[PDB]
Design a protein around this ligand. Structure first.
Ligand SMILES: [Mg+2]
Ligand SMILES: [Mg+2]
Lengths: 98, 25, 151, 92, 101, 92
């Protein structure tokens, strides 16, 4: 359980850029903060997708193996997080702050 | 003067942090 | 006594109209032997150094980048045309001396050119830009404009 | 000497859109700093550790924190209450 | 941080009397709101009694009432009387025609 | 001669137009913001737009009269709001 929470806290992105259809012109890609419940959803879906590439017929076995690899450092979903954070760093000036 | 200077300390700190964020833009 | 043409600075002129954006890059050439000429008065020398000759190097419009008709006067057309200019200034080794930017009018490309020069697209040119100015031409009375359009 | 301008009698004294001071969200400023911290020292750099910890706490339950600063201006209530007294209108 | 912006701190002059309110933010805002160029009169030649038309050959003085491009400032900004504004504008226009401004 | 060479710096900047800014090599976007302020304080963009089409003298006079009234009306409105705020502060 501690391993699961640590993996979810490291894999979930802190922020995510969202397109807001504000104005008749092009929508704005503004970074948005994420709460802990929203962060866990993003990280869990990545884990499930990675788990479903494994060979076992039983989802529990595939999920167990995926969670073990993530607890040991190896996961392909850390790339997804880095790409979501890169986009947000690029659009840092688009933030409103009021 | 202490009562006034205490409220002034808080606001100064707050407004010296919004400036830092707003200026970072 | 000998033509000694040398570049003193570059002028980046942008004309931002309602239907197009024109960007011209020029060199302010100075014959460094002009004062060595014979029969040259103090006034002629000072008048030659107050308005130095200019030579056009790069001339671009929004139609040179493939934007056609109505798209020529839009924000995106100007932003890309400004990028192509900032690139051609580095590909021609014309980023050694100081650049003076002159903006002419207030169309939709004026704010695109400024954004392209204070951003990544113009991170090399902006380092050389020393003076910005406005050259919008206004008339004090002057010729009669066309009649108001009834639309 | 400063020119005083006196209005004619008016049907109302009202501000169309009263300006209000909207304090900035604490979580958004934290995110704007963390994003900047990653821009200079790099993403996940150990220098932004404190920023990450603070951001997580700010957004843990609500991504915009406890927003409890909503305010409305009272200028239009006072303006309509006092206009007849202070407009300087001549007697009937 | 041991530093504060000048706009967030009031420097009490020497020899002046103060109240506790002078250390508050209200004083800062109140000083901004009521900040007018009232000391101009004592430094404003045209608000002293001189005839602005006698300065038509002194572009340096006249250049104090025009913008960066040479546009004569509206009376709302100069604060001059109707007569002085009228005379000052004539002086500037005459100066421009002579070739000095 | 050199007399015409060492006296060209001031001469060059002695015939200024007032529409130029010396760029701040540190923050180059602050210099463009300063230039925009000059344009708006000399009404350069507004004048250019108003010179695109001809307006009859009578219409020009009407527009000038209305604009002045709105400017003066706003000054009178602000004067009354300040009185309201002052009156409210003192408990009226
Ligand atoms: Mg068009
Ligand atoms: Mg015709």
């Amino acid at each position: 359980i501690q391993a699961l929470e640590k993996s979810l806290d490291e894999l979930a992105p802190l922020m995510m850029t969202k397109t807001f259809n504000t104005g008749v012109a092009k929508a704005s890609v503004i970074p948005v903060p994420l709460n802990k419940r929203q962060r866990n959803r993003i990280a869990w879906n990545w884990i499930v997708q990675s788990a479903n590439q494994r060979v076992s017929s039983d989802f529990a076995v595939r999920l167990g193996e995926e969670l073990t690899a993530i607890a040991k450092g190896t996961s392909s979903a850390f790339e997804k997080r880095d790409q979501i954070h890169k986009t947000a760093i690029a659009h840092r000036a688009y933030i409103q702050l009021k | 003067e202490q009562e006034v200077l205490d409220v002034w300390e808080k606001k100064v700190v707050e407004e010296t942090e919004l400036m830092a964020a707003r200026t970072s833009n | 006594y000998k033509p000694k043409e040398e570049v003193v600075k570059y002028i980046l002129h942008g004309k931002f109209t309602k239907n197009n954006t024109h960007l011209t890059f020029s060199s302010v050439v100075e014959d460094k032997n002009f004062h060595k000429n014979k029969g040259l008065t103090y006034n002629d020398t000072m008048l030659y150094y107050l308005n130095l000759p200019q030579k056009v190097k790069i001339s671009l419009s929004t139609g040179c980048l493939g934007f056609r008709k109505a798209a020529r006067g839009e924000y995106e057309a100007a932003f890309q045309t400004s990028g192509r200019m900032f690139e051609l200034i580095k590909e021609k080794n014309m980023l050694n001396k100081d650049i003076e930017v002159v903006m002419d009018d207030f169309g939709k490309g004026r704010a695109a050119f400024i954004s392209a020069l204070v951003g990544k697209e113009g991170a090399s040119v902006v380092k050389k830009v020393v003076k910005i100015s406005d050259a919008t031409k206004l008339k004090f009375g002057g010729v009669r404009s066309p009649k108001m359009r009834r639309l | 000497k400063p020119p005083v301008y006196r209005l004619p009698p008016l049907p109302r004294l009202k501000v169309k859109k009263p300006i209000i001071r909207q304090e900035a969200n604490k979580c958004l400023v934290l995110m704007s700093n963390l994003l900047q911290c990653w821009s200079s020292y790099g993403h996940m750099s150990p220098k932004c550790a404190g920023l990450v910890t603070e951001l997580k706490s700010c957004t843990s339950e609500s991504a915009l924190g406890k927003r409890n600063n909503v305010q409305k201006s009272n200028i239009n209530y006072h303006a309509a209450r006092l206009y007849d007294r202070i407009n300087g209108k001549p007697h009937d | 941080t041991k530093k504060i912006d000048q706009s967030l701190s009031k420097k009490l002059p020497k020899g002046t009397i103060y109240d506790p309110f002078d250390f508050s933010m209200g004083r800062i805002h109140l000083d901004r709101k009521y900040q007018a160029n009232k000391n101009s009169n004592r430094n404003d030649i045209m608000k002293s009694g001189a005839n602005p038309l006698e300065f038509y050959a002194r572009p340096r003085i006249l250049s104090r009432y025009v913008t960066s491009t040479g546009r004569i400032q509206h009376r709302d900004i100069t604060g001059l009387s109707a007569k002085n504004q009228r005379r000052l504008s004539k002086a500037i226009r005459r100066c421009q025609a002579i070739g000095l401004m | 001669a050199e007399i015409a060479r060492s006296s060209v710096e001031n001469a060059q900047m002695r015939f200024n137009s007032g529409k130029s800014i010396i760029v701040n090599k540190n923050n180059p976007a602050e210099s463009f913001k300063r230039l925009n302020r000059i344009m708006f304080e000399n009404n350069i963009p507004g004048d250019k737009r108003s010179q695109r089409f001809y307006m009859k003298p009578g219409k020009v006079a009407e527009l000038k009269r209305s604009q002045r009234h709105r400017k003066e009306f706003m000054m009178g409105f602000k004067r009354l709001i300040e009185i309201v705020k002052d009156a409210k502060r003192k408990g009226y």
